Amino acid sequence: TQYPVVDHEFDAVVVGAGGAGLRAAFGLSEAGFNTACVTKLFPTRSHTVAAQGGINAALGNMEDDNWRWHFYDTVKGSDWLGDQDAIHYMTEQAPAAVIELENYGMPFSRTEEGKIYQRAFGGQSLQFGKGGQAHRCCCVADRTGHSLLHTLYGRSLRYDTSYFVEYFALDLLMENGECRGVIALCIEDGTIHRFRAKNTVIATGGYGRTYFSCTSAHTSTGDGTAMVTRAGLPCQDLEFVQFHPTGIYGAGCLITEGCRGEGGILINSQGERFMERYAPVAKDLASRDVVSRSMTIEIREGRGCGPEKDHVYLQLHHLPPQQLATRLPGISETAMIFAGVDVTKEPIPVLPTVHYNMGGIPTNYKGQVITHVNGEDKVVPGLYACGEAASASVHGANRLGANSLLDLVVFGRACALTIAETCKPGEPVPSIKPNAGEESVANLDKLRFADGTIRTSEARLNMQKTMQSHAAVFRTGSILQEGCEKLSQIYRDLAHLKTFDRGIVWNTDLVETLELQNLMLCALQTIYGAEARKESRGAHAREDYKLRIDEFDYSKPLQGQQKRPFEEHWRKHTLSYVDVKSGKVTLKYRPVIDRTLNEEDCSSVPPAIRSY
Amino acid sequence: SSKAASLHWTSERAVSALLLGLLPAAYLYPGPAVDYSLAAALTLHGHWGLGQVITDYVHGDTPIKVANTGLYVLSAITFTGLCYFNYYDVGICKAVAMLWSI
Amino acid sequence: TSRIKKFSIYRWDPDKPGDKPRMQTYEVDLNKCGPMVLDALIKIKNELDSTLTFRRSCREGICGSCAMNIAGGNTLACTKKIDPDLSKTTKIYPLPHMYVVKDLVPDLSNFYAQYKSIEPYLKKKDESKQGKEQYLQSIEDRQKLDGLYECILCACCSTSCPSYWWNGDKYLGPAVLMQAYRWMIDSRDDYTEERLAQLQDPFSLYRCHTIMNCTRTCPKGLNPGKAIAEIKKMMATYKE
Amino acid sequence: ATTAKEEMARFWEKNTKSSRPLSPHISIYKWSLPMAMSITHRGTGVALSLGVSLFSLAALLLPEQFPHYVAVVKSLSLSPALIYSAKFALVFPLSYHTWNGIRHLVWDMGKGFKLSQVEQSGVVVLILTLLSSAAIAAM
């Protein structure tokens, strides 16, 4: 009524211009689909550009490799909470995915033979875990994501994709359980745009900004994750937040795990390479959930570095300076800017930092969003997801380093491949109601003319500080419940919000209020899923339930074991729902997919003990 | 020519190197050969130079056409007046010396 | 014991009918703020004036969003240290000679379009074996890309170039020109002569007169001025 | 869905007819020595060309030969200081433009592009211009 509404019609609409959204976008245009790409940022400003370490693939440039070993490391790294059918697809398609990127012009670092340089990375091995450290992390120095995103954006200029840059997606257009498209806000002129399409792909990244300190960008507010929540659909495994070991102290900027992959070690206050004690075999190259816990224990036990005993040191000055300039030029500059550290002389002050969300929108290995109805996986018609916004789940309870950038290009391509085989271009686009999505415009105008007691910035900090203390590396039911009561009160106090910018053209005050709404929807499902999960699996470490509870006890022989029913064990996905009006969180559980795509080609790995 | 812009860029630098070498030529070997070479180089280098200023600062179809035509008149008259001074008067080299004998 | 610092910021609101550009001053306590100018802009927006609009994201100088003119020079607000001299007021303007969408937010679409025009992607005369094997590139030919691929398209260099001020409609600018050179010397590219041929006009390339504002202002420490000089040398040497 | 040329056209069509202001540029940008020397190389070049053109026009329009006007100035019996100031003011823009022109030609070969070398070569041009102009005017 008050806002001018523009309508569009496409075969498919992709929400997100990161590494995952771009691959799906021109992949659909590759297949002749009239495809629109809606992104709140210019594509090369996406958080993918900040990625450093690299991207995994069993190319075999450094030694003889096997993608099935990569499969095994990923299944083990996920703590057997990941879907092995999706891990199969990702690890098998990894060589072709990276070769495609290099063929696009990605300026990978090179070996003596002219092939793609691959470095070691945390928790990756040869010979199914019995062959020592693997080197399959293909990288562009330590600016891999920068070159990945700029290569994908350049490649996307060749196709007929219709871009809508700096458009803020508000909600999905749901009718009869199907997705008809997305309604968005044009930031440049303040107009509401409804995009109608037969298929929608959600690649909106993570929501690391729910915490106070995080390596994520200010735009990682989980906007797509909240749209699925407001549509009455579930999110999966949101309580599994990855804490990167080496986030620089203070500014929280990331210091790449490639530092340890090239030879860097972690040092406590007494000069000890303490990872030789927590992981005698993997040492500083253990899984990220193990290292982040190891570093956190050393701090609270009194062996922290600095004048506050609140961090540790990442030592690189024992490495040759020519290697530091060739392999890690980015963090060399960053450590000087945000810490005054010369990596050739002094170590980098690092501490665990929120980095990545293993959870997100539940899909299958084809990229199709699924919901759980009476124990069966119902594919949501017309809805797709890929990247950090989605839960394949190829990462389960803990992601291996250099596997996200792979997730982006593998399942971005997979979404485009799945749409091409299921639908044809030019098929009649589905209709919508004349007032479809008006609840988004009403909620938008409500926040635009907010005149209450609490400002948006004040509410976002109370959420970030609550998540940082009540959902850190270690969690307890008594502390999680205190955070649940705080978050559920902050959400109900969003009615008292207060905005100032009464405009609509580039109203970052209004946009960052919508992002706070999205951050809060994700933060509730995170801390309530963490409070209910009474076990310790991967990143989620409960000190009141230090054990991992599977359907059996895989530490003892399965000979005549009483199988625990699904309602009693925990090797299962957490499915979270949220009543947006009241804020109450509902939790369900669906089984993990242990089967691969071909047992005779890739043996399914049963749960075992998880040590490094 | 499909390479007219790069060939012109090279010619600008070539005339500058030529004009640079005419300064020691005028001091060491003053006479008609250097006077007329200076006449041609000072006009051509100045003409191309003032053209870049017009390309940078003058916009619009007619103003650009008006400026480039008025510049062509200036250059042609300048080269002719310099040749007139070399043939009917003392010449460039000798005029500089007489001016410095003041 | 507070260290109050003054900032003078450009302000314009397109939604105010008849709004005129102006400057507004803010007092920031440096003892309760980060070290970078973006930390002050975010502190101002979160505490003093939430209408102050600007682009930001990575806050680590990798994405290129927060490019602006701080103390008279084009730089990234997230890697530019706040001047601790409390007797000097920091003046903050948007990128120079750009249309202003709101406050510090310029219109980069012509900048983006110029970048598209040079086709910034690998091109081969035979693209049939695309995606089969990895393209071989020696360490030496890969090293030639250092100083070029790191560009974050912040547009600081181009918006500091006077030639781009007067002829930005036809001069490609140092950012786009360096990216063109980045693809010209990529050993895996087969369209080097076509990329050079595109610049055979008086404006696309030859409006650069080696002013070198671009190299001085680059927050990544790159040298787009030197890259343009390598293009010019290639324009005068290649045969057809 | 839009080519690069089309995007550039809509940019100008959208902005020029809009109420959007143009962000300030020359009035707010901090100057430097290489930038000041770049525009000075342009002003000296233009001044030199116009000086040549006024000379050529004078050879075609004045009723007296050059030796006559030199004899008139000599008969004025000017002081050596004024003669020096005139000589210095005549030879300063030529000398600056020559040295900075060689500096430009070096750049065109691709040499001296490190920012610290740009500052060095500029200062060298500045002292070479002064030394050359001082010695020439003394003649």
Ligand SMILES: Cc1cc2nc3c(=O)[nH]c(=O)nc-3n(C[C@H](O)[C@H](O)[C@H](O)COP(=O)(O)OP(=O)(O)OC[C@H]3O[C@@H](n4cnc5c(N)ncnc54)[C@H](O)[C@@H]3O)c2cc1C
């Ligand atoms: C500092 C850092 C370094 C990393 N390094 C590595 C690495 O070396 N290797 C690795 O494998 N992984 C790495 N990761 C993890 C990985 O890079 C990210 O998880 C991944 O890039 C996310 O990509 P994405 O395409 O899913 O979304 P992003 O790249 O985060 O982009 C999100 C996109 O969604 C769009 N969007 C969001 N909300 C909206 C809305 N409301 N309307 C419209 N559009 C919207 C935005 O425009 C944006 O373009 C790193 C992560 C970080 C933070």
Ligand SMILES: CCCCCCCCCCCO[C@@H]1O[C@H](CO)[C@@H](O[C@H]2O[C@H](CO)[C@@H](O)[C@H](O)[C@H]2O)[C@H](O)[C@H]1O
């Ligand atoms: C005919 C003679 C030619 C014209 C002469 C004009 C003289 C004044 C020019 C303006 C000089 O203005 C001044 O230049 C110097 C040198 O680049 C600048 O210096 C700046 O860059 C240099 C390095 O490039 C840094 O070492 C220094 O810390 C920094 O402030 C300074 O920021 C600026 O304030």
Ligand SMILES: COc1[nH]c(=O)c(C(=O)[C@@H](C)C[C@H](C)[C@@H](Cl)CCl)c(O)c1OC
């Ligand atoms: C060598 O070419 C050049 N070199 C320059 O330093 C330059 C400039 O620096 C400009 C900012 C000079 C500006 C036009 C002055 Cl006259 C306003 Cl007080 C400029 O405009 C230019 O032409 C494109």
Ligand SMILES: O=C([O-])CC(=O)C(=O)O
């Ligand atoms: O998250 C990853 O996959 C890798 C990463 O951030 C790093 O380089 O440390």
Ligand code: SF4
């Ligand atoms: S060259 Fe430097 S200033 Fe210019 S766009 Fe690239 S990073 Fe930004």
Ligand code: F3S
């Ligand atoms: S400032 Fe501009 S004139 Fe050339 S050397 Fe840099 S692009």
Ligand code: FES
């Ligand atoms: S925000 Fe990415 S560069 Fe400053």
Ligand SMILES: [K+]
């Ligand atoms: K995820």
